[PDB]
Amino acid sequence: MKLTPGCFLWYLYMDKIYCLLSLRNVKALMVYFHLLDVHHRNTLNDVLFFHFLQHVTNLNKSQIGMIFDLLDWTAVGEIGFDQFYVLICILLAHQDHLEDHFMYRHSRPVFELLDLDGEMNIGAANFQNYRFLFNIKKQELRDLFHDFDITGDRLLNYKEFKLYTIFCTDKSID
Amino acid sequence: TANVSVSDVCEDFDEEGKSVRNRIRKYSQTISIRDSLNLEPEEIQQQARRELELCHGRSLEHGEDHEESETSLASSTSESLIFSLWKPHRTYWTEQQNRLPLPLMELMETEVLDILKKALITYRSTIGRNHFMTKELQGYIEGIRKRRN
Amino acid sequence: NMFVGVMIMHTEDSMKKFERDLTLERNLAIMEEKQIILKRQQEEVNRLMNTQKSG
């Protein structure tokens, strides 16, 4: 198999969601994960992930720890290879201008990435974590939160999040 | 020592349909002419970039792929990445032409296998979460992996 | 007790209408901004269609 059928389907979905499918990007991510995973136990420690982030993205230690906490939903103290691949695809050279629109497209559900609580509601902490991961002004984030809070309860629904994402994508396309 | 087959790295990998061997021969001839004329490295790089752009700068009526390649080569980062990818592949093909396989490749493979085994033994067993030797070994392994990648 | 009750509910009914009017003004601004956004989107779509037709 071409590195399992599920990863092939994920790569096909990424190609159907991106203009450029690159060359052996998933293979490069798997090689980097294998280099990071010393024990080859399909998992990596927080120190190895922090070192990889500092060597590749040169991120801060607190931001790397927050990203590791958000990605590792199992809370077992380790980051899986699939989680590392998902995080690497989420980054996707975020310094590029088109990477902002790619993150606006996000993923197939594009709701649970920001929603760390998982109760179909994004709080202020989730928005702060998103602003830490993706660079955005605090005033702009507050204006976006005010625009998304139609009811005023400081809660974002899945349908409301999809509508906001569609509006942002339509505005960026034109 | 790329240790790759000549029929694999010179199998017309370019999507434009141009032959890799002819482009490699043209690059070698240009490099020989520049070395005879004692050209600077920056001038040699500019000449190689111009030759690679002219390779994709064929008749635009014969397919829009050439036009797309010429547009991509007009940028800075994308053109530099494409030139870096073409130069390593051309160098690997040139090395594999005469005779690439030789010793010390098995030594490198044995070193990589020993490093992987030592890293697995270090990461599998960790009696001390606040120890200094195991953490230093893990940091050295991470740095070596970052440098290799 | 008549004094405290009279002033309590007079103040309550005075502030209720003021807060309702303030929220009505905020809502009117919100719908005006949404209408501006909709008009801008319609103008952009019409301009894109015109450029596609003339191109």
Side-chain angles (χ1 to χ4, degrees), chain A residues 5-6 28 65 75 77 80 93 109 118 123-125 152, chain B residues 2 17 41 48 57 63 74 88 99-101 103 119 126-128 139 143, chain C:
Chain B
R99 254 144 288 119
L100 195 44
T126 309
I127 314 178
Chain C
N1 312 135
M2 293 316 171
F3 254 125
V4 302
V6 155
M7 196 136 187
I8 273 175
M9 318 168 17
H10 275 95
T11 322
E12 156 156 23
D13 304 338
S14 77
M15 276 178 215
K16 156 195 132 53
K17 298 298 284 266
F18 293 159
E19 294 263 17
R20 273 199 159 173
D21 289 333
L22 288 158
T23 49
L24 195 135
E25 191 254 351
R26 183 49 191 269
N27 276 330
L28 189 63
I30 279 178
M31 321 315 317
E32 276 189 351
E33 274 205 347
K34 277 158 160 162
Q35 190 58 232
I36 281 172
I37 284 180
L38 277 164
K39 283 171 184 176
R40 184 181 41 51
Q41 185 256 345
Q42 282 184 332
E43 280 186 339
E44 282 176 355
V45 161
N46 264 341
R47 283 159 191 160
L48 272 161
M49 274 207 72
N50 281 335
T51 51
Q52 279 168 331
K53 282 172 187 176
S54 51

